[PDB]
Coordinates of N, CA and C in Angstrom, one line a residue:
Chain A
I1 N 1.1 -1.1 -0.3 CA -0.2 -0.1 0.1 C 0.6 1.2 0.1
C2 N 1.9 0.8 0.7 CA 2.5 2.4 0.4 C 4.0 2.4 -0.4
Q3 N 3.8 2.0 -1.3 CA 4.8 1.3 -2.9 C 3.5 1.9 -3.0
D4 N 2.4 1.7 -2.5 CA 2.0 2.0 -3.7 C 1.2 3.4 -3.7
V5 N 1.1 4.4 -2.6 CA 0.7 5.7 -2.7 C 2.1 6.1 -3.8
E6 N 3.5 5.8 -3.5 CA 4.8 6.2 -4.4 C 4.1 6.4 -5.6
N7 N 3.8 5.3 -6.2 CA 3.2 5.7 -7.5 C 1.9 6.6 -8.1
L8 N 1.1 6.4 -7.4 CA -0.1 6.8 -8.2 C 0.3 8.4 -8.0
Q9 N 0.3 8.7 -6.6 CA 0.4 10.2 -6.6 C 1.8 10.8 -7.8
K10 N 2.7 9.7 -7.7 CA 3.5 9.9 -9.0 C 3.0 10.1 -10.3
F11 N 2.4 8.9 -10.9 CA 1.2 9.1 -12.2 C 0.3 10.3 -12.1
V12 N -0.3 10.7 -11.1 CA -1.2 11.9 -10.7 C -0.2 13.4 -11.2
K13 N 0.5 13.1 -10.8 CA 1.3 14.3 -10.9 C 2.4 14.3 -11.9
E14 N 2.6 13.1 -12.6 CA 3.3 13.0 -13.8 C 2.2 13.7 -14.2
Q15 N 0.9 13.7 -14.5 CA -0.1 14.4 -15.3 C 0.0 15.7 -14.9
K16 N 0.2 16.2 -13.9 CA -0.1 17.9 -13.7 C 1.4 18.8 -14.5
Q17 N 2.3 17.5 -14.8 CA 3.4 18.2 -15.4 C 2.7 18.1 -16.9
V18 N 2.1 17.9 -17.3 CA 1.7 17.8 -18.8 C 0.7 19.2 -18.8
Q19 N -0.2 19.3 -17.2 CA -1.0 20.5 -17.8 C -0.7 21.6 -17.6
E20 N 0.9 21.2 -16.7 CA 1.7 22.5 -16.5 C 2.1 23.2 -18.3
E21 N 2.5 21.7 -18.8 CA 3.0 21.9 -19.9 C 2.1 22.7 -20.9
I22 N 1.0 22.3 -20.8 CA 0.0 22.7 -21.8 C -0.1 24.2 -21.3
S23 N -0.1 24.5 -20.2 CA -0.2 26.2 -19.8 C 1.5 26.6 -20.2
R24 N 2.1 26.3 -20.1 CA 3.5 27.1 -20.3 C 3.2 27.3 -21.9
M25 N 2.5 26.5 -22.6 CA 2.1 26.9 -24.3 C 1.2 28.2 -24.5
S26 N 0.7 28.2 -24.2 CA -0.4 30.1 -24.3 C -0.5 30.9 -25.9
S27 N -1.4 31.4 -26.2 CA -1.4 32.6 -27.7 C -1.8 34.3 -27.4
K28 N -0.9 34.5 -28.7 CA -0.7 36.1 -29.3 C -0.2 36.1 -30.8
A29 N 0.2 34.8 -31.0 CA 0.2 34.1 -32.5 C -1.0 34.3 -32.7
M30 N -2.0 33.6 -32.1 CA -3.4 33.9 -32.4 C -4.5 35.4 -32.9
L31 N -3.5 36.0 -31.5 CA -4.6 37.1 -31.5 C -4.1 38.1 -32.8
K32 N -2.9 37.6 -32.9 CA -2.3 38.6 -34.3 C -2.9 38.8 -35.5
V33 N -3.8 37.1 -35.5 CA -3.9 36.8 -37.0 C -5.3 37.8 -37.5
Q34 N -6.1 37.9 -36.4 CA -7.5 38.8 -37.3 C -7.1 40.1 -37.3
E35 N -5.8 40.3 -36.6 CA -5.8 41.9 -36.9 C -5.3 42.1 -38.5
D36 N -3.8 41.2 -38.5 CA -3.5 40.9 -40.0 C -4.5 41.0 -40.9
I37 N -5.4 39.9 -41.0 CA -6.5 39.8 -42.5 C -7.4 40.7 -42.2
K38 N -8.2 41.7 -40.8 CA -8.6 43.0 -41.5 C -7.8 44.0 -41.5
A39 N -6.5 44.1 -41.5 CA -5.8 44.8 -42.1 C -5.5 44.7 -43.5
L40 N -5.2 43.2 -44.1 CA -5.0 43.1 -45.6 C -5.8 43.5 -46.3
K41 N -7.4 43.2 -45.6 CA -8.8 42.9 -46.4 C -8.7 44.7 -46.9
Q42 N -8.1 45.5 -45.9 CA -8.4 46.7 -46.1 C -7.5 47.4 -47.1
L43 N -6.1 46.6 -47.7 CA -5.1 47.1 -48.5 C -6.4 46.5 -50.1
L44 N -6.8 45.5 -49.9 CA -6.8 44.9 -50.9 C -8.2 45.9 -51.3
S45 N -8.8 46.5 -50.2 CA -9.9 47.5 -50.9 C -9.4 48.9 -51.4
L46 N -8.1 49.0 -51.0 CA -7.3 50.1 -51.6 C -7.3 50.0 -53.1
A47 N -6.7 48.6 -53.2 CA -5.9 48.4 -54.6 C -7.2 48.2 -55.4
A48 N -8.5 47.8 -55.2 CA -9.8 48.0 -55.7 C -9.9 48.9 -56.5
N49 N -10.3 49.9 -55.3 CA -10.4 51.6 -55.2 C -9.6 52.4 -56.4
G50 N -8.0 51.8 -56.2 CA -7.4 52.3 -57.2 C -7.7 52.0 -58.5
Chain B
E1 N -13.1 31.3 -37.9 CA -13.9 32.5 -38.2 C -12.9 33.8 -39.4
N2 N -11.8 33.6 -39.4 CA -10.7 34.4 -39.9 C -9.8 33.7 -40.9
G3 N -10.3 32.5 -41.1 CA -10.0 31.6 -42.2 C -10.8 32.0 -43.4
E4 N -12.4 32.0 -43.2 CA -13.6 32.8 -44.0 C -13.0 33.9 -44.9
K5 N -12.7 35.0 -44.3 CA -11.7 36.2 -44.6 C -11.1 36.1 -45.5
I6 N -10.3 35.3 -45.0 CA -9.1 35.0 -45.6 C -9.5 34.1 -47.0
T7 N -10.1 33.8 -47.1 CA -10.5 33.7 -48.6 C -11.4 34.4 -49.4
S8 N -12.3 35.2 -48.9 CA -13.1 36.1 -50.2 C -11.8 36.9 -50.2
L9 N -10.8 37.0 -49.7 CA -9.5 37.6 -49.6 C -8.7 37.3 -50.9
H10 N -8.8 35.8 -51.2 CA -8.6 35.3 -52.5 C -8.4 35.2 -53.3
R11 N -10.1 35.4 -53.1 CA -11.1 36.0 -54.3 C -10.8 36.5 -54.5
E12 N -11.1 37.8 -53.9 CA -11.4 39.2 -54.9 C -10.3 39.7 -55.3
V13 N -9.0 39.0 -54.7 CA -7.4 39.2 -55.0 C -6.9 38.9 -56.5
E14 N -7.2 37.7 -57.0 CA -6.4 36.9 -58.5 C -7.9 37.7 -59.1
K15 N -9.4 37.9 -58.8 CA -10.2 38.8 -59.5 C -9.4 40.4 -60.1
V16 N -9.1 40.9 -58.7 CA -8.0 42.2 -58.8 C -7.0 42.2 -59.8
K17 N -6.3 41.0 -60.2 CA -5.5 40.4 -60.8 C -5.6 40.1 -62.1
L18 N -6.7 39.7 -62.4 CA -7.7 39.4 -63.4 C -7.6 41.2 -64.0
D19 N -7.3 42.0 -62.7 CA -7.9 43.4 -63.4 C -6.7 43.9 -63.9
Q20 N -6.1 44.2 -63.2 CA -5.0 44.9 -63.8 C -4.5 44.0 -64.9
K21 N -4.1 43.1 -64.8 CA -3.9 42.5 -66.2 C -4.4 43.0 -67.1
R22 N -5.7 43.2 -67.5 CA -5.8 43.5 -68.0 C -5.8 44.8 -68.4
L23 N -6.2 45.4 -67.8 CA -5.8 47.1 -67.8 C -4.4 47.1 -68.3
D24 N -3.6 46.7 -67.9 CA -2.1 46.3 -68.7 C -1.8 45.9 -69.9
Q25 N -2.3 45.2 -70.0 CA -2.2 44.4 -71.9 C -3.0 45.9 -72.5
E26 N -4.1 46.9 -71.9 CA -5.2 47.9 -72.3 C -4.4 49.0 -73.1
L27 N -3.3 49.3 -71.9 CA -2.4 50.2 -71.8 C -1.4 50.2 -72.9
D28 N -1.0 48.9 -73.5 CA -0.4 48.8 -74.3 C -1.0 49.1 -75.7
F29 N -2.3 48.6 -75.3 CA -2.5 48.7 -77.1 C -3.2 50.3 -77.2
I30 N -3.7 50.9 -76.3 CA -4.7 52.4 -76.5 C -3.1 52.7 -76.8
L31 N -1.6 52.6 -76.4 CA -0.5 52.9 -76.5 C -0.2 52.6 -78.1
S32 N -0.4 51.4 -78.8 CA -0.1 51.1 -79.9 C -0.7 51.9 -81.4
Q33 N -2.2 52.5 -80.5 CA -2.5 52.9 -81.6 C -2.1 54.6 -81.8
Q34 N -1.7 55.2 -80.6 CA -0.9 56.2 -80.4 C 0.6 56.0 -81.2
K35 N 1.2 54.8 -81.5 CA 2.5 54.9 -82.6 C 2.1 55.0 -84.0
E36 N 1.0 54.1 -84.3 CA 0.5 53.5 -85.5 C -0.1 55.2 -85.9
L37 N -0.8 55.7 -85.3 CA -1.8 57.0 -85.5 C -1.1 58.0 -85.7
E38 N 0.2 57.7 -85.1 CA 1.0 58.9 -85.2 C 2.2 58.7 -86.5
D39 N 2.6 57.7 -86.9 CA 4.1 57.3 -87.8 C 2.8 58.0 -88.8
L40 N 1.8 57.4 -89.2 CA 0.8 58.0 -90.3 C 0.6 59.3 -90.0
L41 N 0.4 59.7 -89.4 CA -0.7 61.4 -90.0 C 0.3 61.5 -90.4
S42 N 2.0 61.1 -90.5 CA 2.7 61.0 -91.7 C 3.2 60.3 -92.2
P43 N 2.1 59.2 -92.5 CA 3.4 59.5 -93.4 C 2.3 60.4 -94.6
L44 N 1.3 61.2 -93.9 CA -0.1 62.2 -94.2 C 0.7 63.8 -94.9
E45 N 2.4 63.9 -94.1 CA 3.7 65.0 -94.4 C 4.3 64.5 -96.2
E46 N 3.1 63.3 -97.4 CA 3.1 63.4 -99.2 C 2.4 63.8 -100.2
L47 N 1.3 63.4 -99.2 CA -0.2 63.6 -100.0 C -0.3 65.0 -99.8
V48 N -0.4 65.5 -98.4 CA 0.0 66.8 -98.4 C 1.6 67.5 -98.8
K49 N 3.0 67.2 -98.4 CA 3.7 68.3 -99.2 C 4.0 67.9 -100.8
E50 N 2.8 67.4 -101.1 CA 2.8 67.7 -102.9 C 2.1 68.0 -102.9
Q51 N 0.6 68.3 -102.6 CA -0.1 69.1 -102.8 C 0.8 70.8 -102.8
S52 N 1.3 70.8 -102.2 CA 2.1 72.0 -101.9 C 3.0 72.3 -102.9

């Protein structure tokens, strides 16, 4: 049994690491995009009006 | 949501390039009307120093 808790907390925690891992990983790259396509669309309107 | 815009961006972009091409080669040709209609206003410099 107390082999036991040595492992389970270990597999659980191993998992929290991945949770951290995702947490480390987070977006600005994404936020960037809408701004750009919103911007490119506008230049296209230029060229078109030109 | 952004991808879609991207789409009608692609769209309407290559129809802008259908545009310009066209207007491009157009300008050649309005341009060529200007080299011909010119050589030959004269060679209309014969026909008019002859009359002279």
